[PDB]
Amino acid sequence: VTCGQVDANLAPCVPFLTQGGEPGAACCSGVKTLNGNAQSPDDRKTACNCIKAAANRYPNLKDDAAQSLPSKCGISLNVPISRTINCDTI
């Protein structure tokens, strides 16, 4: 898992992450792609830290949209969607 793939798959989610509403088909497709390609614990930790880096690159979006993104796209995660989670301690 590389952070470039994370960014490419989450790029269609920026409109929903800034303007709310419902995540489109492309954003949910990217979310499910990322979820299905991060299988092993190391893959999931890598993807989590890539997502944290991306969130650092967007430091002015609040959390609620990203919190509702997994349920809206039909996935379930074992971590909260938060800037302050520690990815390497699960």
Ligand X SMILES: CCCCCCCCCCCC(=O)O
Among 22, 39, 58, 86, binds ligand X (CB under 6 A): 58
Which residue is listed with tokens 């954003």?
Answer: 27
Among 39, 61, 71, 74, binds ligand X (CB under 6 A): 61
Residue 50 binds to ligand X (criterion: CB under 6 A): no
Among 51, 76, 86, 89, binds ligand X (CB under 6 A): 51
**CA atoms of 60 and 66, how far apart (whole Å):** 13
**CA atoms of 60 and 14, how far apart (whole Å):** 12
Tell me the residue number closest to ligand X, measured at CB. Answer: 66
Q: Where are the alpha helices (DSSP H) in 38-87?
A: 41-57, 64-72
From 24, 67, 80, select the one nearest 90 (Cα to Cα): 80
Residue 14 binds to ligand X (criterion: CB under 6 A): no
Contact residues for ligand X, defined by CB under 6 A: 10, 17, 31, 34-35, 38, 44, 47-48, 51-52, 55, 58, 61, 63, 66, 69-70, 77, 79, 81-83, 85
